[PDB]
Design a protein around this ligand. Sequence first.
Ligand SMILES: Nc1ncnc2c1ncn2[C@@H]1O[C@H](COP(=O)(O)OP(=O)(O)OP(=O)(O)O)[C@@H](O)[C@H]1O
Lengths: 626, 806, 49
Amino acid sequence: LVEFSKLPEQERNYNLQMSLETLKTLLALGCHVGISDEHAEDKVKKMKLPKNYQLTSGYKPAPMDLSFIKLTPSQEAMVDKLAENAHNVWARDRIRQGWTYGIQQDVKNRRNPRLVPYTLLDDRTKKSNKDSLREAVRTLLGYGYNLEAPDQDHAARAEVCSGTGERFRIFRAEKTYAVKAGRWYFEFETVTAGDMRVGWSRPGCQPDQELGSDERAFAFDGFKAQRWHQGNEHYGRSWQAGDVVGCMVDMNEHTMMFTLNGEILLDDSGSELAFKDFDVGDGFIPVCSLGVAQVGRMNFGKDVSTLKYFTICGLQEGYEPFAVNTNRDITMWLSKRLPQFLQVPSNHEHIEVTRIDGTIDSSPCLKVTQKSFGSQNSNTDIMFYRLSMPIECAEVFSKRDDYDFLMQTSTYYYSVRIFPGQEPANVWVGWITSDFHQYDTGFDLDRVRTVTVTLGDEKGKVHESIKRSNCYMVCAGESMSPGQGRNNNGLEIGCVVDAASGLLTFIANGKELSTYYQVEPSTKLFPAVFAQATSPNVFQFELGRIKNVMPLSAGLFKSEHKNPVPQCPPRLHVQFLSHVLWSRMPNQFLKVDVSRISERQGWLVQCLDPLQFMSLHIPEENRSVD
Amino acid sequence: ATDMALALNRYLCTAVLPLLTRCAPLFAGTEHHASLIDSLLHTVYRLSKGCSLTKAQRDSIEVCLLSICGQLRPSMMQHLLRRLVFDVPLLNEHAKMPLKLLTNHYERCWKYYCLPGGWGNFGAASEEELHLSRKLFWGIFDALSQKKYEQELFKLALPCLSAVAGALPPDYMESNYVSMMEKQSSMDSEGNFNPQPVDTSNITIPEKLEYFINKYAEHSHDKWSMDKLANGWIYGEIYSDSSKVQPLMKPYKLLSEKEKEIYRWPIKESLKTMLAWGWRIERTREGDSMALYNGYSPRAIDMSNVTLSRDLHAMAEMMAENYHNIWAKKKKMELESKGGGNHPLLVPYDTLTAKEKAKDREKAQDILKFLQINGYAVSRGFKDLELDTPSIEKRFAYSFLQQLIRYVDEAHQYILEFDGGSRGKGEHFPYEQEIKFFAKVVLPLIDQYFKNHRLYFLSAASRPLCSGGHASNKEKEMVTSLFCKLGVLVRHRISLFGNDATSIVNCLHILGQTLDARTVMKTGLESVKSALRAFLDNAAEDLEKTMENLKQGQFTKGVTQIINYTTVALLPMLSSLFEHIGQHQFGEDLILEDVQVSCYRILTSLYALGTSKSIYVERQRSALGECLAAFAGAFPVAFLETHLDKHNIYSIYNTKSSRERAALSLPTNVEDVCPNIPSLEKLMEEIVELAESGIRYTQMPHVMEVILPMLCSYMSRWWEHGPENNPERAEMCCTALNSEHMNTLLGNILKIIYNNLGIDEGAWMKRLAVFSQPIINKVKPQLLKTHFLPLMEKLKKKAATVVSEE
Amino acid sequence: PCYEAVLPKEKLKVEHSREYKQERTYTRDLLGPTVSLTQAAFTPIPVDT
Ligand SMILES: Nc1ncnc2c1ncn2[C@@H]1O[C@H](COP(=O)(O)OP(=O)(O)OP(=O)(O)O)[C@@H](O)[C@H]1O
């Protein structure tokens, strides 16, 4: 509370360096610094306050006249970010100390509820430090230094963040409900305004592609007031939150119409028909596209009274609700979130898989090659490949080539040939389980999902620790240990699985790699290769046989359990992880009741009505669907 | 001069060029053979640079090339474009076809350049094309400025310049690295075929690069030994060609150094070219780990499957160029050594065809793939030195408008000199040539720029062009200063102009529409602010001096032509000013400081004009009516609320008090300022009694031509200011008005329509219907039904009449 | 205790871990993709000076 001299000098140092860091922050914000004249400071202004406001320090009780310092709008706009940085420094020092946020302030647990972002911080404390900073910054200019404000930057991120890579979800009715003739009407209530599209889609619409970008769908992008079919036009008016768009089709004359809050939407020209001529084809079904943080509602006109703009527009014209005379609710289908493994299509734009038959001297092989390489739209993203059948680990773990050993053994072998010219560090080889449903543009072996169940004895000894993971693979970058790459022998990682013991050992160019995996009994293991396209030819599976190991066909198939000759039956085929699959919302969900009984009793969750669904289990894929 | 060349020109122009012109639809899909179509374009342009072409042949090439480029894609035209932009500044009559080609080219690829997204399949320009297009624009614009006035040349160039300006993004930040390091063949002015390479003997090999040329000579030796044994060469110590025996299967280490040279010396030359432009390559650590490494096989790796990066491909393309240019140099020395004949392949690398280029491609790919396998990280020698992206000056629009203000100030000076020479005997000047350029190009170029990018000028981060492309605030007050300068340039300068003053007028109308001076008012340069105030005050004082002197001189010619200028251009110009002010609702802040008082005085003048009668007033009745309507739309105060206008908080009397105005000899009261102008109440009672009287238009045309239109503007602007819209803030606001006001007023309009159905008539009904359109938008459909449907019946009951009306 | 982790402006509530529950079909709120909740974890970010 005293002069600078008597004030403890370490506190003096902290005050000085925080002033320095404050002006350094002003510099980091780009605020230009300038003084009108040194005379304006050589003549300091003074005014004095009463005795209660007097102090030991001889410095004036308020030298800076509060009257003629009126801070400028850019400067107030700067002070809040300055307070942001000040609290960031405070909280970073607090974290260096090791504190953590606790809704109740603690010292023995050493927790602070104020250790939160400034935007969420206590209003009183934030305004206290904020007015202190305001006064300091205002005196900073009133001191003669007429600081020139930095640019008031207008650029905003516009909220492009989306959970995972998925950007929008497509909601559509079942394919069987397609309309080929007649005139139909349904409503789409937009709870929020945003990147929503709604319209009529052909049954061939793909969930991943944007609604209306291709020829499958006909939508109305009201966010930008645009039609969408094989491209975008300008049509209609943008909606507000709560606006209702009626999608309106008459299949007799091949016309489409859209309305917003009852009034019809109008083309760029005077025409009222959104889409003038299309083809019946295989019919149309209602569809909507919902963007990030977007909430909408379809009303299929189950109860015709629920439709609220139908009476003013749609009923008199003669249109019919989509669920005009349906006894049971229409089952909606939406875009699946988790990627699934499906067989590589023949017409795939990028992946080409060709089956190489096995000659007397060559093992059967399946090679993955990328068609569109070197051309525009070439995919540099990592794509995940797996074989269609899993090797079975033993139910209980027991605890040239010798034909007897081959007949008594249970080790199975496949190998992958990274084609010379395909970069090895961008290719991973090994096994994955059925649960591998995570998609990333950049996949690292450190990211793989792992858990370690540690069953313990009575007193807590770790008498058994079990590692569990869905991905057991190694990269070729570290397998290329001797260096360089051989044309005569392209990088050949081989995978050996001991189904009787569950030991996964990897051999690389005749050298056993150090990495080894131990799996649980009865584990489904799919051969899998992850690759990034760096060449027209990437890799190929070899179903061959190394000494004292069974071929992969002896493990995958049952009839060939004792055939050492390698085989590649047509059932085995390369699959790739993809997002183009739909999913079905159940017509009925569980009755769940949630409520807080009291402060004492907590929150109650109760379900008392049973529901059941018949599950179809695909035996080879270890997968189940309704 | 050779006769066959004439025969071959005839053959081509009669058979091939017409056929390829009729083949124009077929040239669409060509990304597969873009190289050969580009060679075709280059060679067609070479022929178009044929001196011995007849007029018919020349026209044939013109039509063929324009037709082909019309459908073919600019992602292929860039290669020809860099030569087009380089050879157009010559501005000979020979380059007129290239000028037309660029003209329609920019128009047909408008959205590719202007829109940042462009066509989705097309994409967007690599912005190096945008750089070259900007250089093209500046080159044509300047060389046109210095160019002597040729009528046809300016008729052709103006659409070209407008197309280039519209295509180029106004907000294009000039690339921080301006483009150098171009090949001398491009800088080659004559024919663009001089293939001079760069000097590279000065630079030397690093230890990493000598280790690189080690085992790479081994790779090449082994592969070429494989090729030798494929050709039949056997390990015979004698080098016998027919026997195909050669002792050269020994490794490169076993090879003698003499055979190593010329085998490896061109490798040294290729590496010296590698470093010649200055690219630096950084080896990874496996590169020397394998050196320490020393089952191994000395046989060549195949690099077919691996691919290089796209930027590296672009660099390797100009490397293919430089090696072909050394090749073309050697065959040039061959051609002047032989001293006779021509070379079939003397053409530049871009003019070349892909199949023979494949050797240069394979050379570049093998060397680059070898270095990246060895770990050398190849990139450009140095990254960009510094980013001046905060400098909004490097915006294409900002720099262009800087130079445009330069030319506009120059033209202002040339008009000052022309004003001094109007006092002189001579209307003939050499500077008249430059003003021809200014008026015929800059004015229409301004016109097209603001028509195309008017939303950009409205773009001030307030979300016009939501993708971005805002016109900076300083860009905007320099736009407004341009508006003021054009006003000065047109300030009573009809005869100095070739009566082309109408073009300047239209320029001011569209520029007025593009004005966004409200943000300029909020934040802008104060000298430009005062310039704008002086503009609207000088135009004002001119209009009042003319309107008085037209009455003191009503009985009867420099003042006469001044009046003509005012009422023909200035009054329309300020009317459009007031129009965009009203429609933007922007400019209420413009009219704050003495602008309000000057505008009350302008209102008194316009009222005097509307009430007064003369033959020339009848001539300008529509102009006067739209001027009054525009003023009422722009004007911020309910001027018939004089009883309560002291309650208008926004009025300067409330805002900056009135103390000094009251001290000065001004009425300082709205009722004092406008006593000739009637009040709201007596104005409706007079117009209502006139309507119910139902006289023809001709007895009192002035009402229906100026005030009823201006009353329409009044209702339209003050509807929301009336409690008819917001009953809240009653007596917390100045304006009190009810929907029944303009309801009775429109009923009156319908009654006048009925009583004028019989006789009189004129275009005045149609124009008042145009002005009444917003009012019939405000009116209730329940009012429409009943109060207008019988009037529609009256609109149809005059079957005998032929006059057109709603 | 887990109640201590509630954000100060938020109220703790037990809710369907998945977005869709049982309700009337036209009132069914179709939720689009959500924004990643990276802002939940507060890491101080002082500027570099
Ligand atoms: N201007 C200053 N900047 C930083 N530290 C300072 C300053 N002035 C004094 N200090 C020192 O910082 C400490 C402040 O004590 P205090 O109890 O307030 O700290 P805290 O509980 O960590 O949190 P906070 O300082 O944010 O209230 C003391 O050690 C004091 O000497």
